[PDB]
């Protein structure tokens, strides 16, 4: 709706949407502020046009080119561009000598695996003080390349969000970043040599609210440090070192976290009480794919305020007392009256069961209204269906 | 060369298609084995008029139609062919009750995120006598639906591959699949429940010989386990347990192990010597995104038969003396006579030193013929640029 968003085929097509960019009455457009022309392949004067067109539409803030075949020359036309703020660069062909206008707000770099890292966090250090968002996945980036951060004279210090997964980040390199106070989303997903650790060094960043450490090789240790710090939304999937104690006994609940992604951790029913236990806030989980049965789910249910739960991948229903185990689950979902969502996705329990979760007509209590992903008033007649052929 | 390949758009385009293969001519093909209709979408009479003309082809073995929009339904009418031994059917929405020809060989069920796994592997233990390979990569399989493969009367006795990637296996599951003797490539990764215990249990598996196991939360004593078996290729990628140690003192060197990936595992140079002294014969090796130094890489260069090396995303030169010691490492690579290909990716190593490393005009000792995947031909006018591009 403030977008505009195209793959150009041709030279020919180019120089056409170029001729429309060009039109006078567009200088004025502000409901228009970002282009995306990402799988556009471009020429270097078709580039600069592109600039000069742009030049003239302050309103376009947000430029998009990802996987456009772009090269360190192709950035340098485009870092005369005056009134883009948030660049978007990612599956190029940018290596060791690209530049960037130092009035960026936001610069993506994903994919680009040709790129030179300590080149660009280098450059960066010594330029970009109005960067807010950078994004450096999968761009090889070590513990060496960050250390430009701890420059005297780096100009990155305005940054609030930080993508660095997959790359090589350890313990060791977080203490390059630990000081940037403004930081406040960091992505450090697929870096394995963070562990423990690492996380603990996360400490004296104040303002970090949104952290993802899925495959960190996080145990214990790190979900404790976790516990302590005021975070809104963490993701800890593929961590299965977390399967141990957590060592939580003397940590007050953590009131902060609202979002917990514990995926793919080999979690048992005793995580279960951990979790409502010491992290109370945690209204939107995720458990899917661990080692939990009916029991744990009920005490994830346990929470008065949980509001969205996946607890799929999971068997809660093998196919008489095995269905009144069941039925008694099902029992629970209906009485947690503060439950929106619900994913039970390959749990085995059936569409008759699934149907019967449904709130009844015009009920003015329970909250639950999706279901395995999928709204219970699209839900209930695909369901029903799914019964009636069967019979 | 053995395959037709294509997206048939429109109906009227498969009735076209349909019309070039009833063409008696094609009756005696034997050339063209297999074919790749991905990506179309069909209805019921056009998916029974192609088993049809399939079926007065006998040369035609293989059908693939992954992300079809295919239903069961429609794997009632696939199972009417009559010389397909192979069928890939991945990304489509399959649920609770397809079915498949006995006679199948090969069975590809990936990404169908609607499956019913417990349906499947019931119904393909009562029948699938032929099957040889079988993938389930995603389809929300828990051990509990494993169980149907440990029945007396189950038929499922000849499967030699099995994918199981990114489902919910734990060691539990493993022991349901641990007296099928006849497997000899299963892909486990991706199931954080199996851990050192679930490697453990693939021991009676005598046959087994490529088994991947990236994410599967494995540690030291899995790795241990690995090291007493006869396996040839192991992925233990996003293990980062495997940082610990191996305690392989009282373990005889692994002989059979020619590929051994270990990408992301937080290693250090001390895991460098176990690998050259325990895993001798591992000739294939990514330790690509770990801790190692110049010296763990000098290390795996010890080994005499060494052929393809990968180190990349590891800090190996920081931009004089750290020039001495980048210039050893490069002599290593160039006195290591069986080196095939290195990849030093992301590590520092400059264009210069590269270009230093492609074995001189009529080197008959050194066998390396690609650095950082490109071959040494296309390599040194590409470097020679980029170097003369600089001055």
Same mark, same amino acid.
């Given at each position: 709706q403030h977008q505009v968003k195209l793959v150009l085929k041709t030279s020919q097509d180019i120089q056409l949407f170029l001729n429309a960019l060009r039109?006078?009455?567009? #200088?004025?457009? @502000?409901? =228009? @502020?970002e282009l995306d022309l990402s799988d556009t392949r471009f020429t270097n004067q078709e580039l600069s046009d592109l600039v000069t067109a742009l030049n003239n539409?302050?309103?376009?803030?947000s430029l998009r080119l990802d996987s456009?075949?772009?090269?360190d020359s192709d950035t340098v036309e485009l870092s005369? /561009?005056? #009134?883009?703020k948030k660049l978007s660069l990612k599956s190029?062909?940018?290596?060791?000598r690209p530049m960037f206008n130092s009035m960026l707000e936001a610069l993506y770099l994903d994919y680009?695996?040709?790129?030179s890292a300590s080149y660009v966090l280098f450059s960066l250090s010594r330029?970009?003080?109005? =960067?807010?968002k950078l994004s450096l996945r999968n761009?090889?980036?070590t513990d060496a390349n960050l250390?430009?951060?701890?420059?005297?004279?780096?100009? =990155?210090?305005?940054?609030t969000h930080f993508n660095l997964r997959?790359?090589? +980040?350890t313990h060791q390199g977080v203490d390059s970043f630990?000081?940037?106070? @403004?930081? $406040?989303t960091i992505d450090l997903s697929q870096?394995?040599? +963070?562990g423990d650790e690492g996380v603990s060094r996360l400490? %004296?960043?104040?303002?970090?609210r949104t952290l993802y450490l899925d495959n960190?090789?996080?145990?214990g240790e790190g979900i404790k440090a976790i516990a302590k710090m005021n975070l809104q939304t963490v993701d800890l999937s593929?961590? %299965?070192? /977390?399967?141990?104690?957590?060592?939580?006994?003397?940590i007050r609940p953590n009131h902060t976290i609202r979002t917990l992604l514990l995926t793919?951790?080999?979690?048992?029913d005793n995580h279960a009480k951990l979790i409502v236990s010491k992290? %109370?806030?945690?209204?939107?989980?995720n458990v899917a794919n661990?080692?939990? $049965?009916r029991a744990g789910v009920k005490t994830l249910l346990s929470? %008065?305020? +949980?509001e969205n739960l996946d607890v799929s991948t999971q068997s809660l229903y093998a196919k008489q007392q095995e269905k009144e185990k069941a039925q008694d689950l099902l029992d629970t979902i209906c009485n947690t009256? $503060?439950?929106?969502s619900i994913n039970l996705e #390959?749990?085995?329990?059936?569409s008759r069961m699934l149907l019967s979760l449904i709130p009844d007509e015009?009920? #003015?209590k329970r909250y639950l209204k999706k279901i395995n992903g999928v709204s219970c008033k699209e839900l209930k007649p695909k369901l029903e269906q799914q019964i009636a052929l069967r019979k």
């Open positions: 039109d006078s009455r567009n #200088h004025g457009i @502000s409901s =228009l @502020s539409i302050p309103g376009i803030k456009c075949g772009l090269k005369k /561009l005056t #009134h883009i190029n062909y940018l290596k060791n680009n695996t040709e790129l330029n970009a003080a109005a =960067l807010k761009c090889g980036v250390e430009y951060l701890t420059r005297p004279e780096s100009r =990155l210090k305005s940054l997959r790359n090589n +980040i630990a000081h940037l106070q @403004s930081l $406040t870096n394995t040599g +963070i400490a %004296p960043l104040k303002q970090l960190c090789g996080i145990g593929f961590n %299965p070192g /977390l399967k141990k104690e957590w060592g939580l006994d003397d793919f951790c080999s979690l048992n992290f %109370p806030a945690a209204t939107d989980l661990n080692n939990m $049965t929470n %008065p305020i +949980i009256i $503060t439950l929106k #390959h749990t085995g329990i059936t015009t009920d #003015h």
